[PDB]
Amino acid sequence: TWDEALKRLEASRKALLALLREADPAWLSAPLREGAWTPLMVAEHVALVEDSTARVLRRLRRLALSLEEVLALLDRARAFLLEEVAKADPQNPATFPHPFFGELNPLGWLRAAYHEAHHLKALQAS
Numbered sequence: 497t498w499d500e501a502l503k504r505l506e507a508s509r510k511a512l513l514a515l516l517r518e519a520d521p522a523w524l525s526a527p528l529r530e531g532a533w534t535p536l537m538v539a540e541h542v543a544l545v546e547d548s549t550a551r552v553l554r555r556l557r558r559l560a561l562s563l564e565e566v567l568a569l570l571d572r573a574r575a576f577l578l579e580e581v582a583k584a585d586p587q588n589p590a591t592f593p594h595p596f597f598g599e600l601n602p603l604g605w606l607r608a609a610y611h612e613a614h615h616l617k618a619l620q621a622s
Contacts, residue, residue: 498586501609508612539566547573549608553580559590
């Protein structure tokens with residue numbers, strides 16, 4: 497449900513921020529494997545997708561490098577996302593295409609929760 501996805505996003509964010517803040521600096525900037533991106537790139541990716549999600553939610557409503565840098569990007573996008581979540585109608589039938597999930601309404605877009613869980617899991621596995 498809408499409230500469940502949101503409570504999940506709140507939990508996975510605490511887990512992510514703690515992982516980043518407690519990580520060895522050398523690991524943060526190291527490739528996860530050969531040719532792979534780093535944990536800090538993963539975190540920036542999470543932030544950009546939440547920013548993008550927040551803009552999708554805003555459209556659906558209208559139709560109705562460094563740790564410091566990465567942490568700041570996370571906070572900003574998450575504040576923006578939460579603002580749009582507060583303004584959303586979970587039951588809004590209007591849809592916007594998600595590159596992987598296809599046509600999703602605002603609830604589908606918030607269920608963001610899977611995205612952060614997935615990337616957090618990948619980082620913990622590393």
